[PDB]
């Protein structure tokens, strides 16, 4: 109330599971007028056969949806919806059920959770919520002892013992026959993946002595993360300078897993313009930045 | 309305104006009509008026003899970022939670309609969960059914570091200096957060097995953030001489994990 | 002034784990996807996060792109989200930009990300449920703790 339309073009589903297809631009508001909605299926090279709304058949076409009670291996194909000033398509691919198991390998949704950080499994379904009889949680296809309501949940601080496949099954009855919707999560616990706020080593302002004609090698070191970037700013906006060269950065990993990056700015044939101008070096992270300025002062000062 | 405050070795307290319409909302601080009481003892007790509608408040203070349990809750609480945490009422921790004796919670003045238990259980803690938490519960006697007020201050903290500190300044293992002139080398070091923090930042001078300790001047915390802490301590040479070249100046820095040093060898500009 | 540094292939997801993707309608949407579905729905699900230099550093300057047929870059022009038909620029001759965002970790939650617009400060990239779909929109920070402005970036590193 409302429900997400299947916007994604390619859909993978497992055989024997009640599945549905909901078109977009679906508004069931009381102001909305009724209109002719058409669903068609394609098989192989070309078919474009209109979907059959037969007397309580496996396929159920109503309101905005194309229900399947359930999907089977032969349902794989290209589906299409047509409306007044609206056309949608999908590439349905129905994969084989792992019979010597409780959940199929391919229909897994992996999540990585950090140790001692909030871990949760909420066994929910909203579309088939009215038809659901009982719901259960499984860890590596072994049932879990809980209060086991209309939604059994896990809520704890993650421990390496929580690593495993969590099958979430929803049993429902459809005009006599029992079906189930199973959604497995591939949870893998991993050690403190905490990042450091980067920092440039040395003072914030450097006056680097040198006389005209000669060359300088401004070195900017940084204590940063693996994914962090270190760069130099020397007026690329005013155009390109053929005397300022930004050498390829160097990276090392300290025994305690600390990253140090060094990038040098080569300033060839120092001229009067290269003097009393701030050559900034900065660290950039998802968790912070730090900037350093290097002023070139005459050796005579 | 009569509220009671059971003091100890170290606590805090607040008294906010309660009225039908939120129209607006001494040495002890005052902010947003909510008058706060810091370090009182047995003094801060009695009637307090706020304003026709008049909000009457008859405060009472008494010291706590001893804790009713082993795991008696603190008035300063720490919530780890990104994990599951709890804000337990100190005034109602030792009774555990057989049945919630009508607990009302207030986070920075605003009421918390959902939370009515002895504990606020925060599923996933974020920085905004930080603040002044006030747990209020009514306890009856002979005629007066006075309310009990306890104030817990909670902070959102990141788990203690697993890394030793970092010497930001100096970096270079050498230094160009002119003799017969003063010199003050600065040592800047960054320390990853620790719950119990006992950092070390000191300079020392060594010449092979010979070692000299510098004690003056005092260290200084220049920056303190959420993840880290930067401390700075200088070494002063009133006149650098030829001898200061025979030795090395080493800055020492250490936290609960380990130590890191940066020794600077002095060289003359000549 | 912004200077294109480097790129990374990433899959952006919301906190209810819904994968961000560009549909046939060429609009950026969120949807529940199994690892298989996410893989099979590439390149729509795989985004090109490009990092930039900044003349006035104020957090990780970044562009968000997708190579469906050709590369398309995310714009927040006129406070409205759109995918402009263009490759990430090599240079941006301005302090603020409708295509540049500051990718920033949330305090204590180092793997949760927030993208503030460089052009409209106070406004962030967010997931808002509009009718029958989850749109990637640009909204001003209204209340503390808004989880719709937080995201997870799974790299191919
Ligand atoms: C959700 O709904 C689906 C259907 O839509 C259910 O799927 C069926 O589940 C079973 C078990 O997962 C499938 O597997 C079948 O297992 C048989 C053996 O199991 C028994 O014997 C072993 C012995 O070691 C025991 O350990 C075990 O507990 C069982 O007692 C196999 O024999 C089947 O293989 C083939 O042979 C038989 C004849 O013997 C044929 O009739 C079969 O068709 C098949 O060719 C098979 O592997 C079964 O296939 C599933 N049915 C369908 C139609 O898909 C899910 O169980 C349900 N979810 C839950 C939680 O209940
Ligand atoms: C809060 O808790 C603290 C403990 O953490 C508690 O302190 C203790 O108080 C008692 C008194 O209430 C002290 O014990 C007495 O000490 C005096 C000397 O100072 C002795 O003369 C007493 O001896 C008589 O009683 C004994 C026991 O019945 C007999 O065995 C003996 O023969 C004597 O007749 C007695 O030992 C105790 O030393 C302190 N301890 C500490 C560590 O403070 C405090 O009193 C509690 N608060 C309240 C209000 O009760
Ligand atoms: C190199 O860096 C300088 C300095 O940049 C500043 O300092 C760093 C250590 C970091 O903290 C940076 O984040 C920070 O920007 C650049 O020049 C400086 O730019 C700032 C921002 O534009 C200027 O501030 C403004 O100044 C005006 C006028 O006084 C005020 O009205 C504003 O309120 C604001 O404070 C600052 O004046 C300016 N300083 C200098 C020394 O010019 C510099 O542009 C940059 N150079 C290059 C080549 O990138
Ligand atoms: C459940 O999630 C885990 C990851 O959390 C998946 O495990 C990963 O699976 C691959 C399988 O090949 C592992 O091996 C890798 O293979 C490549 C082959 O090219 C090789 O180059 C690598 O060096 C590596 O050996 C990978 O290590 C493994 N990782 C972990 C942490 O287990 C698993 O596949 C997921 N399950 C499902 C059903 O999707
Ligand atoms: C869950 O289902 C049971 C059983 O339902 C029956 O079997 C299904 C496969 C399908 O054919 C249904 O139409 C059947 O009713 C429910 O148990 C029944 O409950 C009614 C009273 O509500 C009782 O009269 C029946 O005798 C029960 N059936 C049996 C087999 O004992 C049960 O109520 C359902 N629970 C929930 C929470 O949905
Ligand atoms: C830039 O400065 C850094 C830091 O001083 C230099 O890098 C390290 O130097 C130490 C010297 O004790 C070596 O032990 C490390 O192996 C170096 N690490 C790296 C990552 O290079 C760096 O060499 C300097 N570069 C220039 C050209 O001056
Ligand atoms: C600083 O850290 C070093 C290790 O990096 C400590 O040195 C160790 O000291 C113990 C004795 O306490 C010896 O058994 C080890 O062999 C030493 N290790 C090395 C590699 O020398 C040192 O004690 C620490 N200093 C302080 C003040 O804590
Ligand atoms: C598809 O498979 C189901 C399996 O129950 C079967 O009933 C149906 O007839 C099949 N359809 C076709 C077209 O073969
Ligand atoms: C058709 O639908 C689109 C939205 O999908 C709308 O912009 C357009 O105006 C509609 N055209 C007509 C003729 O109704
Ligand atoms: C109140 O009493 C305390 C001792 O319990 C004392 O330290 C404080 O100064 C007193 N305050 C006033 C205002 O007299
Ligand atoms: Cl650190």
Numbering used by the authors:
A (entry chain B): -2 to -1, 20 to 318
B (entry chain C): 30 to 54, 102 to 127, 138 to 356
C (entry chain A): 1 to 157
Please quote the authors directly:
Interleukin (IL)-18 belongs to the IL-1 superfamily and was first discovered as an interferon gamma (IFN-γ)-inducing factor in sera from mice with hepatitis stimulated with Propionibacterium acnes and lipopolysaccharide1. This proinflammatory cytokine is secreted by various types of cells and strongly augments IFN-γ production in type-1 helper T (Th1) cells and natural killer (NK) cells following activation of NK-cell cytotoxicity; thus, it plays a critical role in inflammation and the host defense against microbes. IL-18/IL-18Rα/IL-18Rβ ternary complex formation juxtaposes the intracellular Toll-Interleukin-1 receptor domains of IL-18Rα and IL-18Rβ, to which the adaptor molecule myeloid differentiation factor 88 (MyD88) is recruited presumably with the aid of TRAM6. We determined the crystal structures of IL-18, the IL-18/IL-18Rα binary complex and the IL-18/IL-18Rα/IL-18Rβ signalling ternary complex at the resolutions 2.33, 3.10 and 3.10 Å, respectively.
The IL-18/IL-18Rα/IL-18Rβ signalling ternary complex is formed by IL-18Rβ binding with the lateral portion of the binary complex. On ternary complex formation, the IL-18/IL-18Rα binary complex structure essentially does not change; the root mean square deviations (RMSD) for the backbone Cα atoms are 0.41–0.90 Å compared with the asymmetric unit (ASU) molecules. D2 and D3 of IL-18Rβ are close to each other and directly associated with IL-18/IL-18Rα, while D1 does not contribute to ternary complex formation. The IL-18Rβ-D2 convex surface with the key Tyr212Rβ aromatic residue fits into the concave surface jointly formed by IL-18 and IL-18Rα-D2 with a 613 Å2 buried surface area, which is shallower than that in the IL-1β complexes. The concave surface area is divided into Site III on IL-18 (354 Å2) and part of IL-18Rα-D2 (259 Å2). Site III of IL-18 comprises the prominent β8-β9 hairpin and β11-α2 loop, where the aromatic ring of His109IL-18 forms π-π stacking with Tyr212Rβ at a 3.4 Å distance, which is surrounded and stabilized by multiple hydrogen bonds. In addition to these interactions, IL-18Rβ-D3 extensively contacts IL-18Rα-D3 with the buried area ~550 Å2, to which both electrostatic and hydrophobic interactions contribute. Notably, the NAG-NAG extended from the IL-18Rα-D3 Asn236Rα and points to the receptor C-terminus in the binary complex; however, in the ternary complex, the NAG-NAG chain changes direction and points to IL-18Rβ-D3 within the distance possibly to form electrostatic interaction with Val257Rβ and Asp259Rβ. As a result, despite the same ‘left’ binding mode, the spatial arrangements of the subdomains in the IL-18/IL-18Rα/IL-18Rβ ternary complex differ somewhat from IL-1β/IL-1RI/IL-1RAcP with Cα atom RMSD values of 6.64–6.73 Å. Our data show that IL-18Rβ-Y212A did not bind the binary complex, which is consistent with the structure, wherein substantial π-π stacking were observed between Tyr212Rβ and His109IL-18.
